[PDB]
Amino acid sequence: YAQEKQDFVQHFSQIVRVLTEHPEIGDAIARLKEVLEYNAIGGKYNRGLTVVVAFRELVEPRKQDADSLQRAWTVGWCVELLQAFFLVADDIMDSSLTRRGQICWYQKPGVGLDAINDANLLEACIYRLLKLYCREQPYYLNLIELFLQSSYQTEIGQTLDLLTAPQGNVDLVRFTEKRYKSIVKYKTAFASFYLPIAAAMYMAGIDGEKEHANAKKILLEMGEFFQIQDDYLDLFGDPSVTGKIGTDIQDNKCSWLVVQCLQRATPEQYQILKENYGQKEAEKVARVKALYEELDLPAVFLQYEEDSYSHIMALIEQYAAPLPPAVFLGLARKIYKRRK
Amino acid sequence: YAQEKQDFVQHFSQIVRVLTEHPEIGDAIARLKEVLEYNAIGGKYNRGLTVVVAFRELVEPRKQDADSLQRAWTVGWCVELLQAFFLVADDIMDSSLTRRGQICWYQKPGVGLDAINDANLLEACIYRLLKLYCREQPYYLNLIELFLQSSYQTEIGQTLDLLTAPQGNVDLVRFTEKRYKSIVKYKTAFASFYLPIAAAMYMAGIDGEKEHANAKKILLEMGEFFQIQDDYLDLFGDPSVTGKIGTDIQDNKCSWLVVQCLQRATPEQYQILKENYGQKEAEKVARVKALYEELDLPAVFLQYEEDSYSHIMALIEQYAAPLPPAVFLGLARKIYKRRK
Ligand SMILES: C=C(C)CCOP(=O)(O)OP(=O)(O)O
Ligand SMILES: C=C(C)CCOP(=O)(O)OP(=O)(O)O
Ligand SMILES: [Mg+2]
Ligand SMILES: [Mg+2]
Ligand SMILES: [Mg+2]
Ligand SMILES: [Mg+2]
Ligand SMILES: [Mg+2]
Ligand SMILES: [Mg+2]
């Protein structure tokens, strides 16, 4: 697994080389290399690795030649670039301080709001790689449309996330279970969970609408759990482990935690949450954290993680066939009980 | 021409309807409609109109059925959406105040840096329209790749533009004719001039590499002239006419004007430019404008506009064949002597 991660990371130098190969644009290409090095490295590479692992499990080993395997790790890196693009942009919009153990790319002196165009370049690099390696393949168009559709779905999710979290406005009424499930389905589940398995499926020749629908049932549910864990870690995670500083409380976000708080709060506790949520004051944030702990939300999260795991396992039993259950089980093992 | 513009604008309501048609995403789709209405309307629609006019001139009238014409005005609107995406993002990065006679979308109270995701949605809408109307056409993939390549080229151009214009740093050494030509080729010429004619060419079945190369020779030169005019208007244009407020001097930009100033300045005038360029102080900006006027740069621009027009006309004579010269002449007439 760590050796699998290591093999995937060793292909990054080739990805950068092929993307940063007209002398007039030299300075811009040198900036793109810096944008790639800073923002596509430091994560867990779960999405990129899922493409590589799923491709190997879905394709007959006699058909896994050197060019086929290169295409698989390249498409894995395309999914990492999609993630990099959204994170660079999301860190500006969320006013975040750190990412993957280092200062946010936009927080770097000399970068600032120029990171908007840098994010756009990362997105552009996906289609440059798809054209360079997969142009002659029968699944080329299926991959292009899958990455474009995954970006649109993420952007729609980001729009819902930002509309539910207006700055300077009390938004407790908007923080419902229904709203939450809708935000996380689009902003996380589609591109972080459906996209990597769907890409390996199209590369394996599995283009069937019914097969993709079945994979989607498992993967969108896994994505919802993953975002619930991300919301828990925003406040109760170790920043030395998570690599990022939480901002959901200050940013008035429709977090899984605030939705649970609102379902369990007394009128007195509702007032405390109303007066202290969505504000930059450190003592107001500390007051919301104290309310969550009073309502035993960390324990409520532990019980949800268990119930959700069993539910996802039941969905693998129902919808994995005819794909190897290991395709979905490998990703479940990688995200369950994770504190990073 | 104004009737042609009117026919094109009358199709916008249909574009919005088809793009803003899952009740859970309702609030986000309502935000997308607001993003579309605010940012894709108010311009001159030259790019969108060029697609429609070029398609009509390149396709035999017996092959111009109702569905074919709809595809043409839809692809015209895709080019307007590409422009909208880049302008929303460019206005944030350039710290601009107004656009198309109204306050910049990001300057709107309640929008702010959420405009980054709004720009991404506008870009996403291009591929949604291409899929909705052109998916079954033989040129579908050619159009997808052309819009993706045009975005990458624009982003590379924007990177060069921002690298040459660092905030708080004296960048006069970097402002060369060579650097300028490179920036404007990528940031403007490819997507504003090559993209609309190339799209109509692929829709007409003209996919030949040599035909696209010849069209490119004319159109990249036209794009350079158009950006030189844009730089002139940034300072010497009427904001009631241009619809936007200039920021090139304050933003330390490699403008055509500053390049010309540096070629004509004495050591005393160079010192004046060095002490006053790239700064927010109104009196420093007024000092640079006074230097430009002392060096008769508005007259130097008038002489360049004439010389460039003749050169572009000579390029149409050389490279228009076998395409109707009217394809290129119509766009030249629309941009030459324009003060908007
Ligand atoms: C979609 C969300 C929850 C953002 C972070 O994803 P990861 O937690 O997988 O971050 P990296 O490993 O890529 O850094
Ligand atoms: C590529 C540059 C010069 C930006 C503005 O283009 P236009 O001057 O054509 O602006 P609109 O008509 O679309 O508003
Ligand atoms: Mg965030
Ligand atoms: Mg966010
Ligand atoms: Mg989070
Ligand atoms: Mg600008
Ligand atoms: Mg600009
Ligand atoms: Mg300008």
Burial class of residue A262 (count of CB atoms within 10 Å of its CB; 0-12, 13-18, 19+)? middle
**β partners of residue A98:** A103
| DSSP strand pairing (A102-103 vs B102-103) | unpaired
Put simply, the answer to whether A116 touches B182 (Cβ < 8 Å) is no
| Experimental technique | X-ray
Burial A77-95 (b: 16+ CB within 10 A, else e): bbbbbbbbbbbbbbbbbbe
Following CA atoms B230, B235, B238, B242 in sequence, which dihedral angle do they give, to the nearest 10 degrees? 30
| C-beta separation of A53 from A29 below 8 A | no
Backbone angles phi, psi at A82, to 5 degrees: -60, -45
Q: Nearest-CA distance from B178 to chain A in Å?
A: 8
CA proximity to B197, closest of B213, B217, B219, B224: B219
| C-beta separation of B163 from B185 below 8 A | no
Give the number of other CB atoms < 10 A from CB of residue A333: 12
CA proximity to B151, closest of A119, A133, A137: A119
| C-beta separation of A20 from A33 below 8 A | yes
Q: How far is it, in rounded angstroms, from Cα A93 to Cα A154?
A: 14
A107 Cβ contact partners less than 8 Å away, ≥ 6 residues apart? A91, A97
Our CA angle for A69, A71, A73, nearest 5°, is 70
Burial A116-139 (b: 16+ CB within 10 A, else e): bbbbbbbbbbbbbbbeebbeebeb
CA proximity to B212, closest of B230, B193, B239: B193
Report the nearest-CA residue for atom 10 of ligand 2: B43
**Three-class SS string for chain B?**
CHHHHHHHHCCHHHHHHHHCCCHHHHHHHHHHHHHHHHHCCCCCCHHHHHHHHHHHHHCCHHHCCHHHHHHHHHHHHHHHHHHHHHHHHHHHHCCCCEECCEECHHHCCCCHHHHHHHHHHHHHHHHHHHHHHHCCCCCHHHHHHHHHHHHHHHHHHHHHHHHHCCCCCCCHHHCCHHHHHHHHHHHHHHHHHHHHHHHHHHHCCCCCHHHHHHHHHHHHHHHHHHHHHHHHHHHHCCHHHHCCCCCCCCCCCCCHHHHHHHHHCCHHHHHHHHHHCCCCCHHHHHHHHHHHHHCCHHHHHHHHHHHHHHHHHHHHHHHCCCCCCHHHHHHHHHHCCCCC
Distance of CA A248 to the CA centre of its chain: 16
Backbone angles phi, psi at A46, to 5 degrees: -55, -40
CA proximity to A257, closest of A223, A285, A217: A285
Following CA atoms B236, B241, B246, B248 in sequence, which dihedral angle do they give, to the nearest 10 degrees? -60
Residue of B nearest to A23 (CA): B182
Q: Which two tokens stand for residue A299?
A: 């324990």
Q: How far is it, in rounded angstroms, from Cα A54 to Cα A72?
A: 9
Residue of A nearest to B92 (CA): A113
Give the number of other CB atoms < 10 A from CB of residue A20: 17
Q: Which two tokens stand for residue B33?
A: 């409609």
What angle separates helix B140-164 from helix A26-39, to the nearest 10 degrees? Answer: 100
Q: Which two tokens stand for residue A135?
A: 């142009």
Burial B272-298 (b: 16+ CB within 10 A, else e): bbeebbbbeeeebbebbbebbeebebe
Sign of CA dihedral B28, A122, B145, B159: positive
Q: How far is it, in rounded angstroms, from Cα B103 to Cα B304?
A: 32
| Residue A105 at interface with chain B, using a CB cutoff of 8 Å | no
Q: How far is it, in rounded angstroms, from Cα A267 to Cα A273?
A: 10
> At B318, which amino acid appears?
Q
Q: How far is it, in rounded angstroms, from Cα A236 to Cα A24?
A: 49
Any residues with Cβ below 6 Å from ligand 2, and which? B 43-44, 46, 83, 100, 188, 192, 227, 230
**Three-class SS string for chain A?**
CHHHHHHHHCCHHHHHHHHCCCHHHHHHHHHHHHHHHHHCCCCCCHHHHHHHHHHHHHCCHHHCCHHHHHHHHHHHHHHHHHHHHHHHHHHHHCCCCEECCEECHHHCCCCHHHHHHHHHHHHHHHHHHHHHHHCCCCCHHHHHHHHHHHHHHHHHHHHHHHHHCCCCCCCHHHCCHHHHHHHHHHHHHHHHHHHHHHHHHHHCCCCCHHHHHHHHHHHHHHHHHHHHHHHHHHHHCCHHHHCCCCCCCCCCCCCHHHHHHHHHCCHHHHHHHHHHCCCCCHHHHHHHHHHHHHCCHHHHHHHHHHHHHHHHHHHHHHHCCCCCCHHHHHHHHHHCCCCC
Put simply, the answer to whether A114 touches B160 (Cβ < 8 Å) is no
Give the number of other CB atoms < 10 A from CB of residue A3: 7
| Residue A116 at interface with chain B, using a CB cutoff of 8 Å | yes
B174 Cβ contact partners less than 8 Å away, ≥ 6 residues apart? B164, B254
Q: How far is it, in rounded angstroms, from Cα A218 to Cα A203?
A: 20
Distances in Å between the Cα of B340 and the Cα atoms of A301, A337, B82, B108, B247 are 58, 60, 20, 24, 16
Q: Which two tokens stand for residue A203?
A: 């590369």
Q: How far is it, in rounded angstroms, from Cα A171 to Cα A295?
A: 20
Distance of CA B114 to the CA centre of its chain: 23
Our CA angle for A125, B76, B209, nearest 5°, is 60
In this structure, whether the domain defined by B1-340 belongs to CATH 1.10.10.60 is answered with: no
| C-beta separation of B45 from B340 below 8 A | no
Put simply, the answer to whether B116 touches A92 (Cβ < 8 Å) is yes
Burial class of residue B36 (count of CB atoms within 10 Å of its CB; 0-12, 13-18, 19+)? buried
Q: How far is it, in rounded angstroms, from Cα A116 to Cα A92?
A: 8
Backbone angles phi, psi at B20, to 5 degrees: -115, 35
Following CA atoms B235, B238, B239, B240 in sequence, which dihedral angle do they give, to the nearest 10 degrees? 180
Distances in Å between the Cα of B164 and the Cα atoms of B77, B157, B225, B261 are 32, 11, 20, 17
| C-beta separation of B337 from B231 below 8 A | no
Our CA angle for B236, B240, B242, nearest 5°, is 60
Q: Which two tokens stand for residue A297?
A: 């939300």
B25: nearest CB among A89, A117, A186: A186
Distances in Å between the Cα of A273 and the Cα atoms of A217, A291, B203, B304 are 35, 8, 57, 65
Can you give the length of chain B in residues?
Answer: 340
Burial B301-328 (b: 16+ CB within 10 A, else e): beebbeebbeebbebbeebbeebeeebb
Q: How far is it, in rounded angstroms, from Cα B279 to Cα B114?
A: 27
Q: How far is it, in rounded angstroms, from Cα B190 to Cα B157?
A: 10
Q: How far is it, in rounded angstroms, from Cα B71 to Cα B129?
A: 9
- A322: preceding bond cis by omega (within 30 degrees): yes
Q: Nearest-CA distance from A2 to chain B in Å?
A: 34
A194 Cβ contact partners less than 8 Å away, ≥ 6 residues apart? A150, A215, A216, A219, A220, A223
| C-beta separation of A260 from A300 below 8 A | yes
| C-beta separation of A92 from A116 below 8 A | yes
| C-beta separation of A327 from A203 below 8 A | no
Give the number of other CB atoms < 10 A from CB of residue B266: 9
| C-beta separation of A116 from B93 below 8 A | yes
For the CA of B335, the nearest ligand: 2
| C-beta separation of A122 from A91 below 8 A | no
Q: Which two tokens stand for residue B266?
A: 């004495």
